[PDB]
Structure formats: structure tokens, C-alpha cells
Design goal:
- Chain C: One of its GO terms (cellular component) is ribosome.
- Chain C: Belongs to the universal ribosomal protein uS8 family.
- Chain C: This is Small ribosomal subunit protein uS8.
- Chain C: Keywords: Ribonucleoprotein, Ribosomal protein, RNA-binding, rRNA-binding.
- The structure is cut from a larger assembly and holds chains A (about 90 residues), B (about 140 residues) and C (about 130 residues).
- Chain A is mainly α.
- Helix content of chain A is about 60%, strand content about 0%.
- In chain A, α2 runs antiparallel to α3.
- The two termini of chain A are about 25 Å apart.
- Chain B has about 140 residues and is mostly beta strands.
- Chain B is about 5% helix and about 15% strand.
- Chain B contains 1 helix and 4 strands; from the N terminus they run αββββ.
- Chain B starts with a helix and ends in a 41-residue tail after the last strand.
- With about 130 residues, chain C is mostly helical.
- Chain C has 3 helices and 2 strands; from the N terminus they run αβαβα.
- A two-stranded antiparallel ribbon of chain C has the order 1-2.
- Classes of the chains: A mainly alpha (about 90), B mainly beta (about 140), C mainly alpha (about 130).
- Chain C binds 2 RNA strands through α1.
RNA sequence: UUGGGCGUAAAGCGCGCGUAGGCGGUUUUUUAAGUCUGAUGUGAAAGCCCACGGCUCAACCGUGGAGGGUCAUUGGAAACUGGAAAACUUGAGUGCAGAAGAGGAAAGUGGAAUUCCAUGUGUAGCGGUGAAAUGCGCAGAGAUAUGGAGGAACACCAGUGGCGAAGGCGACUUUCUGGUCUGUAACUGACGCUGAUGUGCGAAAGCGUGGGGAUCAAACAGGAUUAGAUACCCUGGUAGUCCACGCCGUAAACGAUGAGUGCUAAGUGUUAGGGGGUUUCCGCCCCUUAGUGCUGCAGCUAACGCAUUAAGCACUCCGCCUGG
RNA sequence: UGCAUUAGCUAGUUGGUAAGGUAACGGCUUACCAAGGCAACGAUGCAUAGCCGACCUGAGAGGGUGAUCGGCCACACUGGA
């Protein structure tokens, strides 16, 4: 569903530190482009319902990282809200 | 349960539907409504007087009466005792007290109180059945 | 995602007390080691021992019994929980098994016991009715 | 609450996923808020502690503190909670090396069959029957093969196999994928669970469309049996069937066990990954993980039966139940 | 007190802006401004009932009566001034 070099591509351009995989921002382009994959990939297969909750259950797995971005350091949350496009 | 959700929903107690529903009810005669004042005995007047067969295998014919109370509720009321003054239209007094092995009828008829006198030929049950104490 | 530390730790003792064990341990904290000290301060077990590992090291128990192959620890139960934090008054504080158990007391006087709070004239957060 | 149950007795929707809510791993330091105490004021009149007085006893009325030991005016104490500042990673996610498939939506290859029309063929029966018959037979009925077609699926590999939350998933070759799992465990520093709302799936049948009536088949039909028919017997045959195109929202959707975490006798196969010793001419023995199964302590219940794929011993949340 | 087999409640309402006028307060009414404020923690509405002390039985956890007997509220054929 997601290839190895592509996550290891986004750790070059969006990591918080070195060996920082599992970051809040390192599952946003991993999330929403793989949405945009399955948004077109289930546009092909209109009954790909199990692959539908595959990305929606990790919406919250990124959202809880956005939730964790509040309490520790809020300037990183002003940074990461304004970094890319995520509403609310 | 949880004591957390017991705050969210308390232990509401259970109700008890009480026997004799015709004795805890009055009648607002001015407004056609009903009061609830739990008489010992509410008086009434007979409409029908008959008897009934116990459906349990005990065999007799026990005498009952279709009485309408003050609050005009029609009952089937057991008439205890042997002889009576209950042909029709006797303005009688009615207790509770179910007679078992007899469906529907669950009310007694107060002997010797309102318009009947009690039965005569009793000598071991004299205080009941309207008999004054001898000599 | 366990919520009561001092109860699952206490029932693990009774988990091996049933099958007659003589040697177990438990993880540590600021409290739970000193909680385990008040057991061996009274000396219900042989000796509760040292904390060793990186995070919450195992501190031993060494269950001490009677000579008729018996057990001493009858009854093991924490009364408080996340959701119900219970407290005690010093003036009407009872006696576990009417004088045959112990009942510890937890406040900012140091975590004390039944003798150590009846003549301290403080109550606190009671835990164990162990007899 | 103290002081109840949810496998078969009444108590889990069909499963989920999920909004709120509740409740959450681990280890340090601040407050004294919550905790718990100490100085008083201090809580009500017949009612209410203890002892007298008044009543002939008494019924029935006062006394003396107790006195609040609960609320306020007041001092405080931080383990544990509330907030304040950190970390660890088991738990979870993002990594890496691989296994498997009936996991959903799309394109091919071929087999075999019931039905048809035709050849050859031939002529008395062929089919159907527990018992015979209706029927189909003189047109050649079926038959019969190199070979002509259709409907629809695709035994073999097929399993207390595997995958899916569940309804479920099966000739395959390929497309797009889901997801499972192991191992190394690199990293974020608990990022979790329940799950009201909501959203889905939702088996079969039923409301309808286009391929459907090839086979099957409600409804209907025929023949007799049988003491009784058209019932048990039999076919023909309608939608419904098959699939695609709309759903309805229901099942013994049951493992009759809600979901997440600790701990306590075993043996026994088996599915995938890692671990090997001999080796084997790919096989013997054995460690481990996740499981798939079968027997079986302590504990359990009313007993059945459960016992690492708990109904045992503990914690958290939701929901449900209390006679028919 | 209970009912979601009562969920969306309010529009002088919701805050403020000036006059009153009260022993004083203001949306209390009047001219102005934004739709706000109130809500599933069930506002709204319905139905029911004076409240408390007190009674009473409960091991305590307590909760049911009010003729009592006291303290407070409301009423005086009805409805207004």
C-alpha cells in the first residue's frame, strides 16, 4: 500500500530530528497521498471498503499525534498546523 | 455495576402493584375525576346476586354479588355466611379479602353492617356475621 | 492499561500464595517498595528484598509460613481504586479481624499503619485489610 | 455503594467502526487545592446521648452538661489525585526481511454436464415408478461420435486448512489492493480501551429492471398407491431462480460467552516466520513467536462443563437484567 | 418529583447603549447595535406536589408521613384596578 523508499524519501524533507520516524508530520503525506492513492484506487474498485478504513483508522493515529502536539510544545503545533494543509 | 455509572444512572427501586384496586379509589363527583384515599370499606349497592363454582376441584357454590361502589366501579364480591338479606338493591358495605380458588371475585361483603343483618344460626363465629353476643 | 498498581501487585501475591510459593517479587516505585517494607516491618514474610533492574526493578518477597505447611497471609485486598478513593477517620478506625489483622494509612505523614496512625491521630487513604 | 447477574435460567444488537462521555502504562520535583489532622464558634424546639426533677405508678412535662464528633472562622503536612515543568519503552503507531491464501472490484483459458436443432442410425418401445401409470414413441422420440450451439457453474490440489470485524470468503492466469503474521526490533515518546450519537456491511426470502425459465423450483398440473389425494413416489412447469441493476434492515447472524490489560498443572498435534543440532539425498530431533486444535490441575458454578483459543484469580469502560 | 413514547429553546429574548425609579438594581419598559444568549449535564415543555423542622421504622448506609406540633410561603365567591 506504501513502498519503502517513499517513506524514506519523506524523512529527508520532513523529519523533526535524525531517526525521527513516527513523527506527527511523517504520517501526513504518508496518510493523505495514500488516501489520494486509494481515493483514485477505490475510484477504480467501488467496493474497496476494507481498504477504506485502512487509511481512516490512521487518520486518528496522526490526529492523536496532532493531539499530542498541543500539551508538550504548542509552538511546534503552530509550526505543524501551518506547515502543510490540515484543517481544524 | 460501576459506581461511576451508578451516578450516571441510579438504583431506582421497584414498585409494588397492591391488591384490591377498588378500595384505594374515590370519585370527584363534581368533576367526574377519581380520588385515592384507601378506605377500609367503601359502601355500595347490589345489582346482581348469584353464586359461583370453584374451578379448583373443591366443589361448592359460593355466593357472590355484583356490587357498584361509591365510586361507581362494578365488582364481583363474595358474600360470606349462609343466609342473607341480599335479594337485590341492598345498600351494602364491602371489604377487601380475596376468596381463593375463585377467579375474578376477590372482595368480601361485610355482614351485618350497612343494609344487611348478619346470619343467624352461628354460635362459634358469633362476632362475625352480624350476631350480637348472647345475653 | 492496568489502573490499580497496588492491587494487581497484591493479588499476584495471592496468585502464588494459593499454590504454596516461597519466592516471588514485584516492580518498584517511590511507594510500592516502601509499601512492601511495611509488610516486612511487621515481618509477615521472610524478607522483602532489593530493587535491581532499570525501570521498576524486582523486589523479592520470600513468603514466610507456618510449620504445618500453612500460610500466614489470609486475605489480601486493596480497598481503593481509580474511581473510588476511600479514606478513614482516626477516631472510629476499626481493627482487621477484630485485632488479628492490619490496616495501613496513606497521607503526607509518611505511609503509616494501623498502630502507626492510631497513636498518630491522623487518618488517611486506607488500603489493605490483611489478616 | 455498603450488599446482584449477563454460556445453557432473565439479562451481548448480527457484527462492527466510530462522536461525545467515562476510564486509562512506567519512573523523579512544585501546591497542600482533594486527602487527613489541630484552635475555637459550631448545627435546630416536642423528635435526639447520659443523669435527675415533676407527675400515686405512669400516661404526660422541665432540669444539667453532653454538643456536635458533620458547617463556618481558622494553621498546616505530599506519598496518592487536580494543575506545573521531563524521560523510558514494552502498549500502540511510523521502519526494515519475508510467508501464505476462497479478502473485495476488473480482463483471459479450457474441460465436463441437463436443454435444443441436424447428420448417421433405427423401430419398439424411451422415460418415470416403494407399486404401476400420466408422459415422451413411429415425424424417428432418446441413442450414438470426429464433430454444431446454448444456460450456468467449474469435482481433482479440499483441511478441528488459511484470510475477513461480521454477514462471509473455492477451477483458475493477470490487474488494483486490503489485511494477517513472524523476525530485527531502528525510531515518536503512551500517542490506549470502551465505545452513547453517527456511519457501514448486513445471510436468505420479499418490493422491481435486463440478460432467466438450461437444470432446480413455490403456486399450478398429471398418474396411481394408500382404507384415504393432488399427501410419502414421480416429473412437467410459473415467477423466484444464476448474475448484474435498487434495496429492505431482519437469522440458532450462537463460541447460545461485550471490548482492552496482569497472574496460576500439563501433554498433544497443526498454519506462517525466525533459531539450530545432526544431516537428509529435503529428511530426523529440538528452541521460540504468533496462532490453529485435542485431551487434561487448582479454582469455578446449581451441575453441566470451562481450565492459555477459562465460565479461574484481579483492573477499566459500555450495554442489559431483575415473576409469567 | 418524573417523562427524549418531551431536543433544538428564547427574539425585549440575548449582552451593551441613554431616560425613568425603586428603600436600590437592571431587558423592567422605551429609541440603538450583533444574532446573540439557552441548551442532551435534557434548556424547553408536560404531568404531579406548599417547603422545612418534625414524625416513623431501619445495624449503619437511611429514606417513606405532616392528622400532628412548631418555623416560613400562598389564599380569603372569581378576576382585575
Amino acid at each position: 500500500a506504501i513502498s519503502q523508499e517513499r517513506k524514506n524519501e519523506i524523512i529527508k524533507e520532513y523529519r523533526v530530528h535524525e531517526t525521527d520516524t513516527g513523527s506527527p508530520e511523517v504520517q501526513i503525506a504518508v496518510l493523505t497521498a495514500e488516501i489520494n492513492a486509494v481515493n483514485e484506487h477505490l475510484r477504480t474498485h467501488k467496493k474497496d471498503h476494507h481498504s477504506r478504513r485502512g487509511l481512516l483508522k490512521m487518520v486518528g493515529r496522526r490526529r492523536h499525534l496532532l493531539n499530542y502536539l498541543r500539551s508538550k510544545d504548542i509552538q511546534r503545533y503552530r509550526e505543524l498546523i501551518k506547515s502543510l494543509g490540515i484543517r481544524r | 455495576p460501576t459506581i461511576n455509572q451508578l451516578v450516571r444512572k441510579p438504583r431506582q427501586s421497584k414498585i409494588k402493584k397492591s391488591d384490591s384496586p377498588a378500595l384505594n379509589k374515590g370519585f370527584n363527583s363534581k368533576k367526574k375525576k377519581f380520588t385515592d384515599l384507601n378506605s377500609p370499606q367503601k359502601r355500595g349497592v347490589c345489582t346482581r346476586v348469584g353464586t359461583m363454582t370453584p374451578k379448583k376441584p373443591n366443589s361448592a357454590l359460593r355466593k357472590y354479588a355484583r356490587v357498584r361502589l361509591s365510586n361507581n366501579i362494578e365488582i364481583n364480591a363474595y358474600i360470606p355466611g349462609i343466609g342473607h338479606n341480599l335479594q337485590e338493591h341492598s345498600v351494602v358495605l364491602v371489604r377487601g379479602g380475596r376468596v381463593k380458588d375463585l377467579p375474578g371475585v376477590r372482595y368480601h361483603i361485610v355482614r351485618g353492617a350497612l343494609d344487611t343483618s348478619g346470619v343467624d344460626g352461628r354460635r362459634q363465629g358469633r362476632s362475625l356475621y352480624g350476631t350480637k353476643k348472647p345475653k | 492499561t492496568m489502573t490499580d498498581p497496588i492491587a494487581d501487585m497484591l493479588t499476584r501475591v495471592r496468585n502464588a500464595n494459593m499454590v504454596r510459593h516461597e519466592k516471588l517479587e514485584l516492580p518498584a516505585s517511590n511507594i510500592k517498595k516502601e509499601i512492601a517494607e511495611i509488610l516486612k516491618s511487621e515481618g509477615f514474610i521472610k524478607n522483602v528484598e532489593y530493587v535491581e533492574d532499570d525501570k521498576q526493578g524486582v523486589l523479592r518477597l520470600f513468603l514466610k509460613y507456618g510449620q504445618n505447611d500453612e500460610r500466614v497471609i489470609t486475605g489480601l485486598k486493596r480497598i481503593s481504586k481509580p474511581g473510588l478513593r476511600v479514606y478513614a477517620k482516626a477516631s472510629e478506625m476499626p481493627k482487621v479481624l477484630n485485632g488479628l489483622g492490619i490496616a495501613l494509612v496513606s497521607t503526607s505523614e509518611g505511609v503509616i499503619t494501623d498502630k502507626e496512625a492510631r497513636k498518630r491521630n491522623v487518618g488517611g487513604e486506607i488500603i489493605a485489610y490483611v489478616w
